[PDB]
Design a protein around this ligand. Structure first.
Ligand SMILES: [Ca+2]
Ligand SMILES: [K+]
Ligand code: NA
Length: 224
């Protein structure tokens, strides 16, 4: 008797001869174009094979219901195409059911799920507080001495608005904490060097991060 297709990979549910059902995965940034994004990468790659003729792939049903305005699945290659840029204010995700059927003979179809996440655009870079003191004094011959503190904010929502601090230079002489506090990492020496132009970097938590930088002028003071 004819057997139908199965989606890959087929990992058997233990103490059965049944494949565990698959949920394929994709993620698409909102507002980007078809031309930029196509073909959409699916993980793992969509594939079905005859358990024993040809194979036809389709999207059977899905939600939200206007998915056919946004996606096309090639019937022979399973390649997934975006048709229009998605706006995350209208769609945060799509959940699709896909099917594979035998071309010659009874369809004996297999089914899988396909989840497509829509990623929020990271519209803005962090913005340092404009009235921060940037001329900073610190005494020599002191390690772990507090130098000063910066702050930046980011308008975007979620991870896209969460600010992280790092130094752009002199990473052997200073350090910065998650709240923007800068300390010496070693004992400085005025006689050796009395001035540093230190770069602080503010980065957001986005998949595609944005960054800003601030210059601080550090003066090393005599112990007296
Ligand atoms: Ca941002
Ligand atoms: K958005
Ligand atoms: Na078959």
């Amino acid at each position: 008797d004819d057997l139908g297709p199965m989606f890959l990979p087929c990992v058997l549910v233990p103490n059965t001869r049944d494949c565990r059902p698959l949920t394929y995965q994709a993620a698409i940034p909102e507002l980007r174009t078809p031309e930029e994004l196509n073909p959409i990468l699916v993980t793992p790659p969509i594939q079905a094979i005859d358990q024993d003729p040809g194979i036809l792939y389709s999207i059977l049903v899905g939600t939200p219901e206007d998915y056919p305005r946004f996606f096309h699945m090639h019937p022979r290659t399973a390649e997934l195409t975006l048709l229009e840029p998605v706006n995350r204010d209208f769609h945060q995700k799509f959940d699709l059911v896909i099917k594979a059927e035998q071309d010659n003979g009874h369809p004996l179809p297999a089914f899988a799920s396909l989840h497509i996440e829509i990623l929020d655009e990271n519209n803005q870079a962090p913005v340092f507080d404009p009235y921060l003191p940037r001329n900073l004094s610190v005494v020599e011959e002191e390690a772990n001495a507090f130098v000063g503190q910066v702050r930046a904010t980011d308008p975007d929502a979620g991870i896209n608005g969460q600010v992280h601090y790092s130094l752009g230079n002199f990473n052997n002489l200073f350090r910065i904490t998650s709240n923007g506090s800068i300390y010496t990492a070693v004992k400085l020496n005025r006689e050796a060097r009395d001035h540093y132009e230190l770069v602080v970097v503010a980065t957001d938590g986005a998949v595609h991060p944005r960054h800003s930088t601030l210059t601080l002028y550090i003066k090393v003071l005599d112990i007296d």
